Amino acid sequence: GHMAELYVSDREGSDATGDGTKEKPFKTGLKALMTVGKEPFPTIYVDSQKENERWNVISKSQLKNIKKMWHREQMK
Amino acid sequence: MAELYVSDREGSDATGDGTKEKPFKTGLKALMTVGKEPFPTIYVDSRWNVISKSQLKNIKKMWHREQMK
Numbered sequence A: 001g002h003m004a005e006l007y008v009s010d011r012e013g014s015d016a017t018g019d020g021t022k023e024k025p026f027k028t029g030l031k032a033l034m035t036v037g038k039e040p041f042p043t044i045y046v047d048s049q050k051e052n053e054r055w056n057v058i059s060k061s062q063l064k065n066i067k068k069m070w071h072r073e074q075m076k
Numbered sequence B: 001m002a003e004l005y006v007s008d009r010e011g012s013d014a015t016g017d018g019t020k021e022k023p024f025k026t027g028l029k030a031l032m033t034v035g036k037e038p039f040p041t042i043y044v045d046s047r048w049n050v051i052s053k054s055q056l057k058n059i060k061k062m063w064h065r066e067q068m069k
Ligand SMILES: [Cl-]
Pocket: A028, A029, A030, A031, B026, B027, B028, B029
């Protein structure tokens, strides 16, 4: 039932009241990976650090760190 | 470490160390660098506001899961 993209926005999202949609992003990557029920990981978008763009694909470093945590969290 | 600094806009998990001058980028990385309790105070970008208990709870929850080996 899970979807193909996820939005995380440090400044505009909430982990409390957000759902990882573009309209209502999560706030954190820790919150996001908690949601991920199966692989493949959805494509995660983050704040663009540029004034020009709202959104930007997660960095490769940030993704790898989230996934490390996710796998280890899948081992109870 | 008594106070950890985390900055999505300006920090780095790669070259940062959680100092106010070299903040971490995420709480994800920050928790990974805490090996003992009690936790340092965590400050996030607003400039700096202390971490919302709403996200601190998540960080301190996932940190306890880690410590089990
Ligand atoms: Cl995070």
